Amino acid sequence: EMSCAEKLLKVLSFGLWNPTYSRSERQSFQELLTVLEPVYPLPNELGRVSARFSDGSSLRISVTNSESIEAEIRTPDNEKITVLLESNEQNRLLQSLPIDRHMPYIQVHRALSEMDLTDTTSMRNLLGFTSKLSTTLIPHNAQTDPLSGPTPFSSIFMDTCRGLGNAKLSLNGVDIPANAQMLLRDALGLKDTHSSPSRNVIDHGISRHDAEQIARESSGSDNQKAEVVEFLCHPEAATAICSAFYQSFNVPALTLTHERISKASEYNAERSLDTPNACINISISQSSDGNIYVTSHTGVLIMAPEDRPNEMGMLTNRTSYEVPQGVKCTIDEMVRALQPRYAASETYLQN
Ligand SMILES: [Mg+2]
Ligand SMILES: [Mg+2]
């Protein structure tokens, strides 16, 4: 029967919300979608996405600047083919990929029927889904620019302390679980919440011994573990990982959605629900030429007015950037060199 990559390709071609799927099938297909990862795109691509499944199959999807879609599928038989896909109103393919697009509106998605926003777990679950869906590019101004103001990136290492062990993190699609993230925080030298990385890490990256230990705890085949190790030993791996946690990345998105942010906050207060103020989902990618790419997602709750059709949902902010060679893990270096791009979506719970 079909490989995972082939299953995912089918779901994407025909759309996750296809009438023939039951709720239970829709749920199972969403777990396949979790394997999709945004990666560094080629110069002619608006977005590139990659999934490597444990059955040995893989799917890489490229969207050209002209929104042409190509999907390279590798299946256990040794077969390797590139399929041409088209996005239409029926499949919502373009909407079902972790890519940024210019659009006249912030993209709206529907959550699966079983999703809710009761607690930490359910909120992290929703972000697990929305981090795989499309976002709309938003402009910043001097007021909302994460890279402007008196002290851009000043909170970065506290943000990293806050995020590690409390975030979804993948490196080349290899999930780094909570305990491995705590090891990673130690390896960076972030011993306490008011500290910055050790000088040795800044200059040489994470030690090979520390990198091995972190990769060991993580998912992945042995080859994929080697990928993670080689990534971690780069001085700019520390820059990538730390910079990804910046709390101010989503300020443009928060500003344009401030009423619905406020309504969600008031609604949860009123019925005493304990939800986090934000959830974090990060995918870092290094290409075989060594180029490092960060896609960082922050989800915050939103709620539409009572008289509007929707109720509770999530505002997802996607921040994308390259970490250039020679950018060391300091505030000044991040400010000097990083040039992020910002995009958002709104995803609402169903009836
Ligand atoms: Mg790679
Ligand atoms: Mg309403």
TrEMBL record:
A Pfam entry, by short name: EspG
Keywords of the record: Hydrolase, Metal-binding, Protease, Secreted, Thiol protease
Molecular-function annotations in GO: cysteine-type endopeptidase activity; metal ion binding
Claim: Membrane is one of the keywords in the record: no
Residue numbers binding Mg(2+) 4: 204, 233
Coiled-coil residue spans: none
Residues bound to Mg(2+) 2: 193, 286
Keyword presence, Metal-binding: yes
Binding-site positions, Mg(2+) 5: 305, 308, 310
UniProt-annotated binding residues for Mg(2+) 1: 193, 195, 286
Function noted in UniProt: Alpha-tubulin-specific protease.
Quaternary structure note: Monomer. Interacts specifically with alpha tubulin, a major component of microtubule.
Family: Belongs to the protease EspG/VirA family.
Name of the protein in its database record: EspG protein
Lineage of origin: Bacteria, Pseudomonadati, Pseudomonadota, Gammaproteobacteria, Enterobacterales
Gene that this sequence comes from: espG
